[PDB]
Design a protein around this ligand. Structure first.
Ligand code: UDP
Length: 428
């Protein structure tokens, strides 16, 4: 059994990357994938696609209508000015006629879409093509959203008091669209997760949504200076520090993290991202005292290569979903520093699962250097962290032995959906 699938991620690198990783697993099961996004997004992940997928993954351009304030270079959330987000969402909706013509041209057996393309589902439906939603975050995130929109039985999933305000402002500021998108998913919703981590939240999400929730697994994807420096350090002795691709540290946050890294006296690699100089942003004399014991990287760093390296011993993470799946696959315990959005809940999940220890902030929500240093030391160095180091090792082994069992379940489910949908279509 094989299917020709058109996949439509939301316009963020953080969404197309999981869609691309799912496409690769389906390709290795003899599906043909059309991965459809704006040209500015396709040009980027284009380079990261091995020629092994030359036959099975085809990129399909969906240009948006452009305006002076939103030229094609801004047809993505990556580096987008925040005031332009409603204009980008509107432009995406208005590409619907272009999308219908892609569907008429390719006539795939199936559309896999993301969290808000109501117009895309409707278009496929009018051409008698079924549509299945793929959630690129976990079931804890999805079932919380339903609990918020369709009105919580898990006491380990809670919010610190200083996290309530950011959560309240986010939910008090379209929910109907998000519910409708999920409701129009044909039979199942696919989700980037696995039962050993999220089983009971998966089941809860299934009961709330009225859909079978099908986990697709973790979907994890010449020596540079970073790797050359890592080669010189002891085993499991370096902490990697990165806060994702869409969050910027405040000035206060950046200072305390720098003091915490120096107080912790654990070798580090810290990627620093600034909105559109290094020695100017760090406390006086910081780089001089650190010497060879750490390095600060502006902008971007090879995250998977670093986490894979035998010298790496910990990951200071905002707990974005891709980053925590990668860390779990590669056996690196997490120093959890959730920043925004779904991250507090991911942090609660990873502490409960046993692979993370959280840096808890003060009542006022601010960071302390001594809390950062204490948690880095106990995860990477001290006896207090052996359980977290051991569970990370254990999880990595199991995921490496799991391979692609979840993908076989995904294929079988999608074949059944598409067969039934086609038999009903022959009746017209
Ligand atoms: O310097 C960096 C920062 C991020 N990433 C990658 O960017 C993604 C971050 O995804 P996640 O969902 O963890 O964070 P988000 O960007 O959604 O907040 C992961 O695949 C990381 O490996 C990377 O390769 N290098």
């Amino acid at each position: 059994g094989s299917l020709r699938v058109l996949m439509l991620p939301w316009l963020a690198h953080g969404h197309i990357s999981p869609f691309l990783e799912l496409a690769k697993r389906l390709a290795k099961k003899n599906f043909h994938i059309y991965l459809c996004s704006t040209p500015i997004n396709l040009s980027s992940i284009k380079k990261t696609i091995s020629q092994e997928y030359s036959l099975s993954i085809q990129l399909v351009e969906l240009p948006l209508p452009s305006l002076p304030d939103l030229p094609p270079q801004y047809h993505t959330t990556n580096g987008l000015p925040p005031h332009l987000m409603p204009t980008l969402k509107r432009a995406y909706e208005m590409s619907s006629p272009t999308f219908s013509n892609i569907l008429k041209t390719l006539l795939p057996d199936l559309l896999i879409y993301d969290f808000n393309q109501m117009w895309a589902v409707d278009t496929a439906t009018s051409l008698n093509i079924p549509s299945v939603q793929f959630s690129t975050t976990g079931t804890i995130t999805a079932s919380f959203a339903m609990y918020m929109l369709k009105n919580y039985p898990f006491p380990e999933i809670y919010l610190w008091e200083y996290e309530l305000e950011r959560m309240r402002k986010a939910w008090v500021e379209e929910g109907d669209q998000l519910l409708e998108c999920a409701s129009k998913s044909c039979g199942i919703i696919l989700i980037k997760s696995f039962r050993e981590l999220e089983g009971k939240y998966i089941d809860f999400f299934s009961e709330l949504s009225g859909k079978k929730i099908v986990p697709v697994g973790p979907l994890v994807q010449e020596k540079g200076e970073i790797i050359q420096w890592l080669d010189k350090k002891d085993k499991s002795s370096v902490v990697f520090v990165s806060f994702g691709s869409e969050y910027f540290l405040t000035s206060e946050e950046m200072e305390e993290i720098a003091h915490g890294l120096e107080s912790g006296n654990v070798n580090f690699i810290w990627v620093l991202r600034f909105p559109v100089s290094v020695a100017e942003a760090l406390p006086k004399g910081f780089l001089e005292r650190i010497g060879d014991r750490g390095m600060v990287v502006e902008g971007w760093a090879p995250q998977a290569k670093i986490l894979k390296h035998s010298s790496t011993g910990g990951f200071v993470s905002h707990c974005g979903w891709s980053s925590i799946m990668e860390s779990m696959k590669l056996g690196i315990p997490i120093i959890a520093m959730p920043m925004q959005l779904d991250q507090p809940f991911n942090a609660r999940l990873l502490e409960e699962f046993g692979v993370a220890m959280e840096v808890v902030r003060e009542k006022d929500g601010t960071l302390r250097r001594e809390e950062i240093a204490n948690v880095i030391r106990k995860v990477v160095v001290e006896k207090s962290g052996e359980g977290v180091r051991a569970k990370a090792r254990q999880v990595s082994e199991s995921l490496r032995k799991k391979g692609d069992e979840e993908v076989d379940e995904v294929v079988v489910e999608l074949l059944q959906i598409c067969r039934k949908y086609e038999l009903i279509g022959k009746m017209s």
